[PDB]
Subunit: 262 residues, 2 copies
Amino acid sequence: MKTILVTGGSGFLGRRLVSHLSKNYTVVAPTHGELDLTDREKIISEVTKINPQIIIHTAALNGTKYLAEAASKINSKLIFCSSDQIYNGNAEKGPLSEDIDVHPVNVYGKHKLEAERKLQEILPTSVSLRLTWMYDHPSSKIPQHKNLPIMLLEAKEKNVPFVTTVNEYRAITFVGEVVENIEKTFELPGGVYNYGASNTSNSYETYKEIAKIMDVPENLVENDTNRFKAQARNISMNIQKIEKHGIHFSNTVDGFSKMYKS
Amino acid sequence: PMKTILVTGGSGFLGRRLVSHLSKNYTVVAPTHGELDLTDREKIISEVTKINPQIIIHTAAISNTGLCEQNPELSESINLNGTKYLAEAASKINSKLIFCSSDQIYNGNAEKGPLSEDIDVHPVNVYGKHKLEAERKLQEILPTSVSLRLTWMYDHPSSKIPQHKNLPIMLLEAKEKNVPFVTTVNEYRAITFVGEVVENIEKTFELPGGVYNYGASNTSNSYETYKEIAKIMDVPENLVENDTNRFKAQARNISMNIQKIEKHGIHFSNTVDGFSKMYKSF
């Protein structure tokens, strides 16, 4: 049985991955205390002692550079969780491809892009997955942060409108479609891959459409057109590179009903 | 679907071992101290109610978050209260609660040999008193609850899963540090491999409510036990030290009699065989 190291096993995506990979794998999910990525040599030792054949990096500079080098001495396969936020500085239209030049405008986008770029340097075999904003079922038994469906529920519950805009093109993904597709990335050649649902409509129309399935009034979803006024934020991904390998994600609205009616 | 199980302290020593073992034939819900704060009665009742575990495995231990032996005197108070709250929540949904007790409840007995679960017990320290006092508050509230008196446990010295410094790791390092490990012949204590504890946990689910000794047996004292385990690991004998000053007045006999547990089909190897077994499988 192949052994897999998952960083941040207590986070949203980490616990789901460990609890899913625990079926047919030996999953080692160290804590922040048990594996602290600010210590170069401790990272080397644990990764050297654990000997994971695959490393899933989900936590959020130094931690990545040190963990990447540790994977590099043992010829390990590292899956880094990147973000669609790398595209937030792009002025183009439509689903973006992985070979387009990106210039993130905020801290989050620049740090994910720079962590992935240092990853390609150290260990070209490592795979970068550009993730979206994710969620589980509002009424899921597994803990989750305050994400999309949950915020639309509290717009109806608190009667406070949810503020979005038509100047953002964003896709949201169900965590399971990411959790149930994660094994396929292990065999993918090293590179950067868009990894999530697709979206052809803007966030106002997208969240308006999801508002009917959850039966919240449409008016509790607001279109603030002053946001992204200067340049619209288009982080809609083109996941066709990932589909040539057999990995498929349903689109934002379809993927939502699929899990919601279950 | 399949039966849903709640494990408290899923990041702790016994919690992680259980979650990764039970995630295989069950749906394991392991909230953090954040999502399952055991200091608030009502989130516990609400959270346990919306979760609906058919089985609740209590690891019963402060996450240390919210303390750091910096007010050791509330640990006793909140740790029975958390068990006290979970007992109501399990009782409110007719759930099966598996409580991790301790063999340290026997540390005040002057008898000799393996001790039984019906023994009159008079724990001498806070932890022995706290588990017995937690045991009795659980049985008051939820008679169906199963209390397992656990021992000091361990994983393989060179295991891939992180663990704190338990026996084998302390003996390896007596050799590395050249500093002897200090034990005594005035303590009769059993240690169990954690895997033999996790792979027997499903059998306790159908077990009638009560208190059960749940671990390895031991007929030898701690000096002889750790010497024999040190020889298997190739630590010299002289790195195991005999402090005759410990428990001089009354010897600490917490060796358990696992006769109740074998009658229900649950079997544990004795301390040294169980160590020799797991040391080799690696």
